[PDB]
Design a binder for this molecule. Sequence first.
Ligand SMILES: OC[C@H]1O[C@H](O)[C@@H](O)[C@@H](O)[C@@H]1O
Ligand SMILES: [Ca+2]
Ligand SMILES: [Ca+2]
Ligand SMILES: [Mn+2]
Ligand SMILES: [Mn+2]
Lengths: 239, 240
Amino acid sequence: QDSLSFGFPTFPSDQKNLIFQGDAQIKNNAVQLTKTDSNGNPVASTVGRILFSAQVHLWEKSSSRVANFQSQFSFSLKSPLSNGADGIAFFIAPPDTTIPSGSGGGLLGLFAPGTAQNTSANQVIAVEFDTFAQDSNTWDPNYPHIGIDVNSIRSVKTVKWDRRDGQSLNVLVTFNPSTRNLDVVATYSDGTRYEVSYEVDVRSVLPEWVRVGFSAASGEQYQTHTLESWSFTSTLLYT
Amino acid sequence: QDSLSFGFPTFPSDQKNLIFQGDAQIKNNAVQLTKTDSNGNPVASTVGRILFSAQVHLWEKSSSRVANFQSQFSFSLKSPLSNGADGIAFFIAPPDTTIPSGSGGGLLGLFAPGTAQNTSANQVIAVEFDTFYAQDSNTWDPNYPHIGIDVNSIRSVKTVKWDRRDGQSLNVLVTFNPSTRNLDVVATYSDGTRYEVSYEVDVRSVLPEWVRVGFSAASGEQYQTHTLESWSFTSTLLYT
Ligand SMILES: OC[C@H]1O[C@H](O)[C@@H](O)[C@@H](O)[C@@H]1O
Ligand SMILES: [Ca+2]
Ligand SMILES: [Ca+2]
Ligand SMILES: [Mn+2]
Ligand SMILES: [Mn+2]
């Protein structure tokens, strides 16, 4: 299809179009990307991802068209620790994507250790919300941030962000094929706003058909990564 | 998802979200539901169906919600002879639905010969466009071309006389309103000729909560092409 859209105002347990990977599962009308104990508390060493089943037609060679898409979602992070980790990300990748071997912790379940920083060994665009160390994650700034990843865990750009325990963050990620701008706008309920944009030609990074979803992980330090709602729309346009 | 929508202005050969059953295949940016030869002409004894891969949440027990949906599509029928068979249908059925054994010809690839008229043995809502075309092989339904609404039976609960026009595209709009429980069908040719048929039906008592939607077509001894040219669909769960 040239156009596709779906909306999950909430996530009831009865799902049919979601692909669950790792420890991801539905609990309390929300998606818990990372594992939580029986009491609902986060645990260490966990990775989880979800993908929408239907493939998205991102671009089409024959017609020289590229999709204009919008992804709106909200999530909350919670942890009894002073340093909850590691983060959650919205990502776009090839349809057969699976969790890479040893991609826990700072790799967010998105990249394999051996090629995490090799743009030629990866095909993925992701928007990450990182809450976690200059000794391990020697590739990220010295503070929580929102980062745009293009075939590498080493963000092409980042902006400072504040982690607020248990508070929902509303995010809108849009891509405009005419300007090739990928824009990210995130807000907390009190109006605090964060914005970051990057110009990228998706045709040179991703295949024509892709899948979209979310990934999260916790290493030694942990926190819940709760996806509360998600709406997505994409339509092929002439450029 | 509470809401889902997709649109196929045309059908390129590179499809990823369509389930092809029987002889259905993409050809010339359109879906040929029934088999065609090298010249592109219709052949006999052929059945084909397509379904969208994502499941549609038609209703939700826990919340007491039922979906409002709309399906818009266009198709054309062509045959070397002045008339053709057997017809095409838009249908809604359980996710694992497959072509019933021996459901060719007049059964449109939707029902099994043994229970084609047994409502308790079927779970399907379909809007068919019948053009044959044969009281000898299709004793059911009125004796003239028609559009019919099928609910668990090949014997339409409601029909309206229809005109077959070789090679001309018919634009169809199928809508279901959970508030009135009316399933409305409006079909029109480019010159403005319009056909309307509707029926009240509680989808909850007929189909499971999650379903798949698609099209089916068949040709027995008599044949014609059943070309699906475009299709857009959209559903949203609403409180009743
Ligand atoms: O195709 C016309 C006609 O051919 C045969 O008689 C059978 O397959 C019928 O079901 C069908 O209606
Ligand atoms: Ca980072
Ligand atoms: Ca009929
Ligand atoms: Mn990090
Ligand atoms: Mn018939």
